[PDB]
Write a protein that holds these residues in place. Sequence first.
Motif, PDB file in Angstrom:
ATOM      1  N   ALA A  79       0.808  -1.214   0.000  1.00  0.00           N
ATOM      2  CA  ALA A  79       0.000   0.000   0.000  1.00  0.00           C
ATOM      3  C   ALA A  79       0.838   1.259   0.000  1.00  0.00           C
ATOM      4  CB  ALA A  79      -0.928   0.011   1.202  1.00  0.00           C
ATOM      5  N   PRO A  80       0.199   2.407  -0.256  1.00  0.00           N
ATOM      6  CA  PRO A  80       0.952   3.651  -0.176  1.00  0.00           C
ATOM      7  C   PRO A  80       1.531   3.884   1.193  1.00  0.00           C
ATOM      8  CG  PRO A  80      -1.063   3.963  -1.411  1.00  0.00           C
ATOM      9  CD  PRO A  80      -1.188   2.665  -0.710  1.00  0.00           C
ATOM     10  N   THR A  81       2.552   4.706   1.246  1.00  0.00           N
ATOM     11  CA  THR A  81       3.283   4.947   2.495  1.00  0.00           C
ATOM     12  C   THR A  81       3.729   6.403   2.546  1.00  0.00           C
ATOM     13  OG1 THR A  81       5.144   4.190   3.875  1.00  0.00           O
ATOM     14  CG2 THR A  81       5.586   4.198   1.539  1.00  0.00           C
ATOM     15  N   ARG A  82       3.772   6.917   3.760  1.00  0.00           N
ATOM     16  CA  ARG A  82       4.391   8.204   4.065  1.00  0.00           C
ATOM     17  C   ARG A  82       5.815   8.119   4.621  1.00  0.00           C
ATOM     18  NH1 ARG A  82       1.311  12.538   4.092  1.00  0.00           N
ATOM     19  NH2 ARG A  82       2.916  13.338   5.538  1.00  0.00           N
ATOM     20  N   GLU A  83       6.411   6.933   4.673  1.00  0.00           N
ATOM     21  CA  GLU A  83       7.693   6.802   5.395  1.00  0.00           C
ATOM     22  C   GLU A  83       8.921   7.496   4.801  1.00  0.00           C
ATOM     23  OE1 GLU A  83       8.365   2.623   6.321  1.00  0.00           O
ATOM     24  OE2 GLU A  83       6.552   2.543   7.590  1.00  0.00           O
ATOM     25  N   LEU A  84       8.958   7.773   3.500  1.00  0.00           N
ATOM     26  CA  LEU A  84      10.082   8.504   2.889  1.00  0.00           C
ATOM     27  C   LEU A  84       9.944  10.034   2.975  1.00  0.00           C
ATOM     28  CD1 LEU A  84      10.642   6.233  -0.293  1.00  0.00           C
ATOM     29  CD2 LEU A  84      12.154   6.612   1.607  1.00  0.00           C
ATOM     30  N   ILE A  85       8.746  10.502   3.285  1.00  0.00           N
ATOM     31  CA  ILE A  85       8.462  11.923   3.300  1.00  0.00           C
ATOM     32  C   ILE A  85       9.315  12.544   4.340  1.00  0.00           C
ATOM     33  CG2 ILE A  85       6.778  13.712   3.580  1.00  0.00           C
ATOM     34  CD1 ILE A  85       4.761  11.681   2.515  1.00  0.00           C
ATOM     35  N   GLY A  86      10.068  13.542   3.921  1.00  0.00           N
ATOM     36  CA  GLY A  86      10.948  14.267   4.826  1.00  0.00           C
ATOM     37  C   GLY A  86      12.402  13.875   4.695  1.00  0.00           C
ATOM     38  N   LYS A  87      12.701  12.806   3.986  1.00  0.00           N
ATOM     39  CA  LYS A  87      14.082  12.397   3.827  1.00  0.00           C
ATOM     40  C   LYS A  87      14.676  13.134   2.664  1.00  0.00           C
ATOM     41  CE  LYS A  87      13.693   7.710   5.857  1.00  0.00           C
ATOM     42  NZ  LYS A  87      12.925   8.302   6.978  1.00  0.00           N
ATOM     43  N   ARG A  88      15.951  13.418   2.785  1.00  0.00           N
ATOM     44  CA  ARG A  88      16.774  13.870   1.705  1.00  0.00           C
ATOM     45  C   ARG A  88      17.904  12.891   1.472  1.00  0.00           C
ATOM     46  NH1 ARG A  88      18.682  20.152   1.156  1.00  0.00           N
ATOM     47  NH2 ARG A  88      19.707  19.908  -0.867  1.00  0.00           N
ATOM     48  N   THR A  89      17.937  12.295   0.271  1.00  0.00           N
ATOM     49  CA  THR A  89      18.863  11.173   0.038  1.00  0.00           C
ATOM     50  C   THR A  89      19.702  11.350  -1.191  1.00  0.00           C
ATOM     51  OG1 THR A  89      17.068   9.784   0.956  1.00  0.00           O
ATOM     52  CG2 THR A  89      18.964   8.627   0.011  1.00  0.00           C
ATOM     53  N   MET A  90      20.974  10.991  -1.115  1.00  0.00           N
ATOM     54  CA  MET A  90      21.837  10.988  -2.281  1.00  0.00           C
ATOM     55  C   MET A  90      21.997   9.582  -2.836  1.00  0.00           C
ATOM     56  SD  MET A  90      25.831  12.528  -2.270  1.00  0.00           S
ATOM     57  CE  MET A  90      26.377  11.115  -1.053  1.00  0.00           C
ATOM     58  N   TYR A  91      21.970   9.488  -4.172  1.00  0.00           N
ATOM     59  CA  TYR A  91      22.055   8.216  -4.887  1.00  0.00           C
ATOM     60  C   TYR A  91      23.203   8.282  -5.884  1.00  0.00           C
ATOM     61  CZ  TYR A  91      17.373   7.630  -3.104  1.00  0.00           C
ATOM     62  OH  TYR A  91      16.308   7.471  -2.250  1.00  0.00           O
ATOM     63  N   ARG A  92      24.243   7.487  -5.674  1.00  0.00           N
ATOM     64  CA  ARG A  92      25.371   7.381  -6.576  1.00  0.00           C
ATOM     65  C   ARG A  92      25.130   6.229  -7.513  1.00  0.00           C
ATOM     66  NH1 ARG A  92      29.592   9.588  -8.136  1.00  0.00           N
ATOM     67  NH2 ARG A  92      29.693  11.036  -6.404  1.00  0.00           N
ATOM     68  N   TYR A  93      24.832   6.562  -8.758  1.00  0.00           N
ATOM     69  CA  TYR A  93      24.485   5.589  -9.771  1.00  0.00           C
ATOM     70  C   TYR A  93      25.721   4.979 -10.444  1.00  0.00           C
ATOM     71  CZ  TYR A  93      19.651   7.073  -9.568  1.00  0.00           C
ATOM     72  OH  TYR A  93      18.340   7.291  -9.154  1.00  0.00           O
ATOM     73  N   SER A  94      26.820   5.705 -10.360  1.00  0.00           N
ATOM     74  CA  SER A  94      28.100   5.288 -10.908  1.00  0.00           C
ATOM     75  C   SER A  94      29.149   6.293 -10.442  1.00  0.00           C
ATOM     76  CB  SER A  94      28.065   5.356 -12.433  1.00  0.00           C
ATOM     77  OG  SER A  94      28.234   6.713 -12.842  1.00  0.00           O
ATOM     78  N   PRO A  95      30.418   6.020 -10.743  1.00  0.00           N
ATOM     79  CA  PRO A  95      31.420   7.040 -10.409  1.00  0.00           C
ATOM     80  C   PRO A  95      31.223   8.455 -10.965  1.00  0.00           C
ATOM     81  CG  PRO A  95      32.485   4.931 -10.743  1.00  0.00           C
ATOM     82  CD  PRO A  95      31.054   4.778 -11.252  1.00  0.00           C
ATOM     83  N   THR A  96      30.473   8.600 -12.055  1.00  0.00           N
ATOM     84  CA  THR A  96      30.304   9.876 -12.707  1.00  0.00           C
ATOM     85  C   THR A  96      28.856  10.418 -12.631  1.00  0.00           C
ATOM     86  OG1 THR A  96      29.772   8.747 -14.748  1.00  0.00           O
ATOM     87  CG2 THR A  96      32.077   9.265 -14.464  1.00  0.00           C
ATOM     88  N   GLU A  97      27.916   9.659 -12.040  1.00  0.00           N
ATOM     89  CA  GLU A  97      26.507  10.041 -11.969  1.00  0.00           C
ATOM     90  C   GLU A  97      25.943   9.986 -10.537  1.00  0.00           C
ATOM     91  OE1 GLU A  97      24.513  11.170 -14.346  1.00  0.00           O
ATOM     92  OE2 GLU A  97      25.993  10.993 -16.012  1.00  0.00           O
TER      93      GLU A  97
END
Lengths: 264, 265
Positions: B150-168
């Motif tokens: 089901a839908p969720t509110r648990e990520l609301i308020g987080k700020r997250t960085m995602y490293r997709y590769s060494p250059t992205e």
Amino acid sequence: VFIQVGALADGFAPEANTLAPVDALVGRTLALEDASGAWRVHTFEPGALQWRDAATDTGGRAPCRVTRLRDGLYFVDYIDTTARATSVSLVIDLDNGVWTSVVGTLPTEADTRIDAFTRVARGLPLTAVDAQFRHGTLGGHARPGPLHAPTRELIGKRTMYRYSPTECYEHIYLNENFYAWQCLQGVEGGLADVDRCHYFKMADELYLFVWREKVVPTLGVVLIDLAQRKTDGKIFGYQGGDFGTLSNFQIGAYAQVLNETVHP
Amino acid sequence: PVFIQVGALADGFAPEANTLAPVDALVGRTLALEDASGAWRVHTFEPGALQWRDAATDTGGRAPCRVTRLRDGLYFVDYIDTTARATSVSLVIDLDNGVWTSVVGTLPTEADTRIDAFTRVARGLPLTAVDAQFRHGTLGGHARPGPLHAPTRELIGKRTMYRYSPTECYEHIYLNENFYAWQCLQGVEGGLADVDRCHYFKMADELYLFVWREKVVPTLGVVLIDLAQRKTDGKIFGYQGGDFGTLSNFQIGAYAQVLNETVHP
Ligand SMILES: [Ca+2]
Ligand SMILES: [Ca+2]
């Protein structure tokens, strides 16, 4: 659901944390000069000003607001009725002899009808709201201070702005060109966008922040004083969705810096 | 300064990507995806591909697919549904609890993208023309299936960085139940940002399905975010170029780091 600037104005009207205008410039004639030469002479009266392009001696008279968030610096805002959908905002530092102007223009309907993906295709900006900036000195001021300039000092802050008991937004200053906003409480409650923006430093902990919206055409101009934790500015847009009557209204908020983000 | 086409983004995300290896665990299985209304779509897996049969439209097809396993028991399946225009299908399947979610996404036609944002505002239309339909159900034959996604509110308020590769490298700021902001910190979109329409669902403890639909360059993103393992696995789908022709659908995966949590007084 996104809303028109005239309805935004209505939501911001009551119990607003706006500064009371000051008459401190009444009787002054300020010669704004910049590197291109004399720009515009402004002569202030109670509630109004007369302005003259220094070259043509062509101008107008307009109702104007003058506020003083920080001592010694004045924010002057007026609609330039000699042009289509144009507002003019100035910040004048009397003791340093320096000024910044923001001349803002809202788009025509034909401009708004060029969609974002086509703007991408053509290398055009996503926002059709235009803003021109000038930074100059006051004529007759000996030994003016440094010109105002772009600043990186807000980047990485996330700040909440309580505009009234019913209107609250937050800004997240992402990078030199973009910020994210969301309406936490208010008639825009739950809305958010990223928009193009511009940051200048007026004084220690005092910033001029200008934004230009891409969904509902809007120009925002605000002075953010992080020492006082207070802001003072205006929002300019069309009253409705018909490109006719203009809406230009004062805003002011209590500011609270929620956090600072550093990217390793 | 400059937005790019999804095909260019694919090229930038290709080398040294933090993607998961596809897995052949489901080869030979038929998964009967059911929901409250009845049968939705049965999927039979073979090496690199699946066959599907749609109960309600009574249609089927074969397609190549990707199957990946971020967390034990949970599979992410993705394929382009060539029987319809510009359509992608992503499944999250939990073989432990017997439950599933599907996202069927459609990219807009050129005529649709030409309706500008201000006109959309005046008509009450969504700003994104990318369409996404969600289903949640149980697996047929699975005894005593667990609670539905089901839908969720648990990520609301987080700020997250995602490293997709060494250059992205991007960050996401999960603003509220409908919207998030993104910015490209490093990459071919470096310095770009927007807010886009999103959807959040909870798959398991600290495991979320996040879906977004972009309004500038038409794009669908579907990703599992595992905050326990600090890793994500998903896909991005859009047109290769600006001509509404060839499709790009490419795997992504990132190392995740939560930068802060913001609570509004
Ligand atoms: Ca606005
Ligand atoms: Ca994107």
